[PDB]
Structures are given as C-alpha cells and as structure tokens.
Amino acid sequence: IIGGEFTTIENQPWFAAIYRRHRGGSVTYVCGGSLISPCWVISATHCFIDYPKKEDYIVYLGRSRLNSNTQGEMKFEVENLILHKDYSADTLAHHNDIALLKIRSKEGRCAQPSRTIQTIALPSMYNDPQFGTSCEITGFGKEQSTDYLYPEQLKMTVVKLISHRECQQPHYYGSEVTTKMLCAADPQWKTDSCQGDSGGPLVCSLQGRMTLTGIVSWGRGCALKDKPGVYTRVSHFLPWIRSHTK
Numbered sequence: 079i080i081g082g083e084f085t086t087i088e089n090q091p092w093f094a095a096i097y098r099r100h101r102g103g104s105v106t107y108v109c110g111g112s113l114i115s116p117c118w119v120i121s122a123t124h125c126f127i128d129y130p131k132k133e134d135y136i137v138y139l140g141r142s143r144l145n146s147n148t149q150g151e152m153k154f155e156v157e158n159l160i161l162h163k164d165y166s167a168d169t170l171a172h173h174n175d176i177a178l179l180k181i182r183s184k185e186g187r188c189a190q191p192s193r194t195i196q197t198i199a200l201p202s203m204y205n206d207p208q209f210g211t212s213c214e215i216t217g218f219g220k221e222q223s224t225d226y227l228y229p230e231q232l233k234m235t236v237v238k239l240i241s242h243r244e245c246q247q248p249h250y251y252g253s254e255v256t257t258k259m260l261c262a263a264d265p266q267w268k269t270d271s272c273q274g275d276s277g278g279p280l281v282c283s284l285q286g287r288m289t290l291t292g293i294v295s296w297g298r299g300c301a302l303k304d305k306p307g308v309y310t311r312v313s314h315f316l317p318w319i320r321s322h323t324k
C-alpha cells in the first residue's frame with residue numbers, strides 16, 4: 079500500500095496473509111486474501127498460477143505483522159486450491175483473476191471466528207456501489223514502487239471507485255479494462271495498492287453493509303497518474319464462487 083496508514087488485524091479481521099514455502103524451508107510472503115466463510119479464503123489466481131502446488135502455501139488469519147505471531151492468529155494449510163479455469167494475463171490486464179483456497183488447520187478445522195478473525199460479506203448481483211464511493215484496501219504490499227522489502231506492519235488506505243467509462247479513457251486503460259473489472263484510485267494519485275497487495279480485499283460499505291466488492295488484481299505501476307488500481311468485480315463471479323464452494 080502506497081500512502082495510507084498503518085493498521086492492525088482487529089480493524090481488518092477478514093484479511094488473510096498468504097505465504098509460500100520454498101525448497102530448503104524459507105517462507106516468503108505472496109499475496110493477501112479475504113475470509114468469505116470459515117473454510118474459504120478468496121484471492122487472485124495470478125498469485126498462484128506459476129506455483130500451483132497447494133502444499134506450498136501457508137495462510138494466516140488474525141495476523142497483524144509480516145514477521146510476528148500475533149496474539150490470537152490462526153495458521154492454515156490449503157486443502158483445495160481452486161484457480162479460475164479461464165484465468166489469463168495480457169501485458170497489463172489479468173482476466174478471471176480470482177481464486178479460492180479451502181483452508182484447514184493441522185487438526186483439520188476451519189477458522190474459528192473471533193474479535194480478530196471474521197468473514198466479509200459477498201456482494202449481491204447487479205448491485206455494486208456507484209462511482210465516487212470510498213472503499214478501503216488492505217495489505218502487506220510495497221510502500222513505494224522502488225522498494226524490494228514489504229512493510230512489517232499491515233497497512234490500509236481508502237480509494238474511490240472510478241466508472242467503467244472513465245477507466246476506459248485513452249490515458250487510463252482504454253479497452254484493456256473490461257466490465258468484469260472495477261477501477262479505484264486516489265483523485266490526487268498519492269495512495270494505492272501495489273505489488274504484494276494482490277489478492278487482498280477492496281471493501282465497500284454499501285447500504286450499511288461492509289462488502290467484498292473487489293479483489294486487488296492489476297495496475298500500471300503504483301499510485302501513477304491516470305493509472306487506477308484494477309480489481310476483480312466480485313459480483314460477476316457469484317455463480318462461480320457458489321459452485322466452487324458447494
């Protein structure tokens with residue numbers, strides 16, 4: 079997250095921290111995710127497509143720091159890694175950038191909801207917030223594009239949704255951004271998601287309900303002028319999510 083504020087997991091209790099185990103035992107951070115039901119975390123297929131072995135992943139819920147075992151956190155392995163069969167990547171745009179991770183503790187249990195571990199509601203069909211609505215993003219991604227390290231403390235920021243017609247303007251993304259994607263950015267271009275925030279949530283309060291409107295997917299650079307963050311439009315994928323979690 080470029081700009082924004084440092085936060086803790088009690089403020090974003092649906093946030094999942096996803097890591098990967100390498101040959102030799104080193105563990106590195108991969109992407110964010112969101113808890114949609116006790117056994118299911120939703121994220122972005124581009125985070126996993128090049129390393130599709132479910133055994134390599136570690137998922138934490140209730141974790142506030144990249145290298146601390148936060149009090150109350152829960153650690154999980156991935157029982158089922160579901161990648162979207164029509165996922166694809168263009169030079170900038172990622173398509174069907176959505177994935178499901180069925181999670182299990184070493185005892186075979188799903189998440190236990192608590193003050194610091196909670197689900198986030200899915201959106202309803204054909205009912206996303208209007209352009210100009212403020213939504214929040216959360217993640218352990220880069221603080222500056224030139225950084226190679228990720229921040230130790232979880233961050234959040236607030237951005238505004240941008241219409242499809244504005245996002246398809248020539249100086250924005252043209253025809254590369256589709257109706258299955260949602261743009262969101264800072265009008266002053268000082269805060270955004272960045273590399274390492276992929277898979278994480280874009281949460282919008284809609285009609286008084288906190289909702290997982292989007293999933294961090296792609297963007298040209300980070301916090302660049304006329305280059306919004308692009309998010310998978312979760313409401314489009316409700317049939318896919320329902321069918322793949324049944």
Ligand SMILES: N=C(N)c1ccc2cc(C(=O)Nc3ccccc3)ccc2c1
Pocket residue numbers: 124125270271272273274275276294295296297298299300301305306307308
């Ligand atoms: N400007 C943004 N909001 C934004 C969002 C997501 C991003 C993802 C990556 C990224 O590294 N994606 C990726 C990583 C590995 C394989 C495929 C895509 C880089 C910059 C981003 C900026």
